[PDB]
Design a protein around this ligand. Structure first.
Ligand SMILES: Cc1ncc(COP(=O)(O)O)c(CN[C@@H](CO)C(=O)O)c1O
Ligand SMILES: O=P(O)(O)OC[C@H](O)CO
Ligand SMILES: [Cl-]
Ligand SMILES: [Cl-]
Ligand SMILES: [Cs+]
Lengths: 269, 394
């Protein structure tokens, strides 16, 4: 059991820093271009990664990520190829925490327990299953704990107390704090004084809280840390830069670098 | 925790994002409450009788069974307002929405039949209705789309994914996740996340209850078997429900065979698929070896769901109900046969159920058997499709 999340947060704490975590779809817009997009993200200052595996029916994603899956699907990407990518990424960056954004069927397809064994074999640190709520999570988190994978659980803005004590006790690595309602998109931002949620998450000894959904400006990364969160996740913002610069591979990485440099800078003491 | 069991054996569950769980737990409490409320039942019963046309007929088919020992009755859900059984449960679901204070209605549709029933229910009960439909379905169901729009509904084409029914199902749950505080998602079949399989069953169970009463009256006995086609399972579990504890009664569900099970181009996940997790439930599915959900195929646009209701998968596993398939050609022939000999134009969907009943009759013509077929819809929507088929040959 590596402790890549536990350590990153300890280090960031001693530097009174916040975490910035970009999301991308694996193989968007192609395996090789995706591999060097992730390399540009880590180099530009990303503290951790959340990576999506293309799925045919992403019922939790808005249009931006929906396009990313189809771009990836037009390239021949498979769950098998994605695991070869995850292995290469770990071989290049030993310390960065890598989390998977998964849809349930890809995990359940040929055995929940075999999917989490593969993640451990390739160096994946955490797995969030978008369509498995806490009430249905038992076989997933049990399989994840048996393979030293942290199960990530979404804490929505409408959460009551029983949920928060469940999320605090079942989850490891980090807690996904939803900014708003609905699905994925940089379009809709709009936090809901998460302050109190973050306090009882801390009161219930939950894993550090990362806020996600709608985070597209460095002022949001700053505000989130000040609210009590340990950092921010931003997905569609990254994916939109890729989508905009498809015919310009060298300028795509250039703006990708300048965006991560901005959000990461918004996170430090 | 829930008030009701979300599982039929290993099948079912509530596999939705965490944000949608309060919406589901709210829907379940409204349902359990409305089921104990006599003034809810009175209102429901009244819309079914005086607006929808219940009870529907149970028609005997002397002509089609001549020369054999089979007696065939048709449950005439084709005579229901809207032309299909879909109307039964949208009236109950729309009353559930108002009971929760909801103002808007979200719906998914493939053949357009559920979209039309959702629209008519919304027009009647003063609800603003928006309907999602794959862009490939919209182009192919311009009649039903126009009907939906005539009835005040917003038809939103979905270009995501493969632009068919499973993609409209995705867009409705996406919509619902942000709008659930004002809107109700009116799922169109006995599938999806709990409490929908339970709710859709209980709102379609008058089909079987009426059939039991009407057959005890006309024949003095229970049927040997009731036969229904299975897209998502709405009309089939509606017929099965009141008979599940009458263990002497056979329960036969017919999945679309497409061009043939051997050809891979079918829509029979219950018997020829693999259990997966999608649309908020654990159920058999049409999927790649990778776990990507693919499409069904059928000549019948209404049997295009890529999965099946979990209670059907459960009833299959304990051996209580049996599930067969019927190819496109078999359905077209049953379609032709009911037109010429009983003067009823069935839906291509229900033609699958009838085609299996004709097979039970024809393969063993001396078998004494009392059969009931659920005629889930009328076939006026399919005469164009049937025309182009037999124009391409003779
Ligand atoms: C007349 C008729 N009979 C049967 C079915 C199958 O639905 P069921 O298997 O859930 O009963 C349908 C499906 N119609 C659904 C599925 O596409 C719709 O959205 O329009 C139908 O239109
Ligand atoms: O796209 P976002 O920034 O709204 O967040 C969703 C991420 O892509 C996944 O966590
Ligand atoms: Cl009548
Ligand atoms: Cl006879
Ligand atoms: Cs089906």
């Amino acid at each position: 059991h590596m402790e890549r999340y536990e350590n990153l947060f300890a280090q960031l704490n001693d530097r009174r820093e916040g975490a910035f975590v970009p999301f991308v779809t694996l193989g968007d817009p192609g395996i090789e271009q995706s591999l060097k997009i992730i390399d540009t993200l880590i180099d530009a200052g990303a503290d951790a990664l959340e990576l999506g595996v293309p799925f045919s029916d992403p019922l939790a994603d808005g249009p931006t990520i929906q396009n990313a899956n189809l771009r990836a699907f037009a390239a021949g990407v498979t769950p098998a190829q994605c695991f070869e990518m995850l292995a290469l990424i770990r071989e290049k960056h030993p310390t960065i925490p890598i989390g998977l954004l998964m849809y349930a069927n890809l995990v359940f397809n040929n055995g929940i327990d075999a999917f989490y064994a593969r993640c451990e074999q390739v160096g994946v640190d955490s797995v969030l299953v978008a369509d498995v709520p806490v009430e249905e999570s038992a076989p997933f988190r049990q399989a994840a704990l048996r393979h030293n994978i942290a199960p990530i659980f979404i804490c929505p803005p409408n959460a009551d107390d029983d949920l928060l004590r469940q999320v605090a006790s079942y989850g490891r690595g980090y807690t996904y704090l939803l900014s708003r309602s609905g699905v994925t998109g940089a379009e809709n931002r709009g936090a809901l004084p998460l302050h109190h949620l973050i306090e009882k998450l801390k009161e219930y000894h939950a894993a550090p809280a990362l806020q996600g959904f709608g985070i597209s400006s460095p002022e949001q990364v700053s505000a989130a840390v000040r609210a009590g969160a340990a950092g921010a996740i931003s997905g569609s913002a990254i994916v939109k830069i890729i989508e905009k610069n498809l015919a310009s591979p060298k300028q795509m990485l250039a703006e990708l670098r300048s965006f991560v440099s901005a959000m990461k800078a918004a996170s430090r003491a | 925790t829930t008030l009701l069991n979300p599982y039929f054996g290993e099948f079912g569950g509530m596999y939705v994002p965490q944000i949608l769980m309060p919406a589901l737990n709210q829907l379940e409490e409204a349902f359990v409450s409305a089921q104990k409320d006599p003034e809810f039942q009175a209102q429901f019963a009244d819309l079914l009788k005086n607006y929808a046309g219940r009870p529907t007929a149970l028609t005997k088919c002397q002509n089609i069974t001549a020369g054999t020992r089979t007696t065939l009755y048709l449950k005439r859900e084709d005579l229901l307002h809207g032309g299909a059984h879909k109307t039964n449960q949208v009236l109950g679901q729309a009353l559930l929405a108002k009971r929760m204070g909801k103002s808007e209605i979200i719906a998914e549709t493939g053949a357009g039949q559920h979209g039309v029933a959702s629209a008519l229910a919304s027009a009647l009960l003063g609800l603003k209705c928006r309907i999602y439909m794959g862009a490939k379905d919209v182009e192919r169901q311009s009649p039903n789309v126009f009907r939906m729009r005539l009835m005040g509904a917003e038809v939103i084409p979905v270009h995501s994914g493969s632009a068919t029914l499973k993609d409209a199902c995705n867009e409705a749950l996406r919509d619902w996740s942000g709008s659930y505080e004002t809107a109700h998602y009116m799922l169109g079949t006995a599938a999806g996340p709990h409490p929908y399989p339970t709710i859709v069953r209980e709102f379609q169970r008058m089909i079987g209850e009426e059939t039991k009463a009407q057959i005890l009256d006309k024949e003095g006995r229970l049927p040997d078997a009731v036969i229904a086609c299975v897209g998502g399972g709405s009309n089939a579990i509606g017929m099965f429900a009141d008979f599940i504890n009458d263990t002497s009664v056979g329960l036969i569900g017919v999945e679309p065979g497409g061009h043939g099970i051997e050809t891979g181009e079918h829509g029979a996940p219950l018997k020829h698929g693999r259990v997966g997790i999608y649309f908020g439930m654990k159920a058999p599915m049409m999927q790649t070896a990778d776990g990507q959900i693919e499409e069904s195929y059928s000549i019948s646009a209404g049997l295009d769901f890529p999965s099946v209701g979990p209670q059907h998968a459960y009833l299959n596993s304990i051996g209580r109900a049996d599930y067969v398939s019927i190819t496109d050609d078999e359905a077209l022939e049953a379609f032709k046969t009911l037109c010429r000999h009983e003067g009823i134009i069935p839906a291509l969907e229900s033609s699958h159920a009838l085609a299996h009943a004709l097979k039970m009759m024809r393969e063993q013509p001396e078998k004494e058997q009392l059969l009931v077929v659920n005629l889930s819809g009328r076939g006026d929507k399919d005469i164009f499709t049937v025309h182009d088929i037999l124009k391409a040959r003779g």
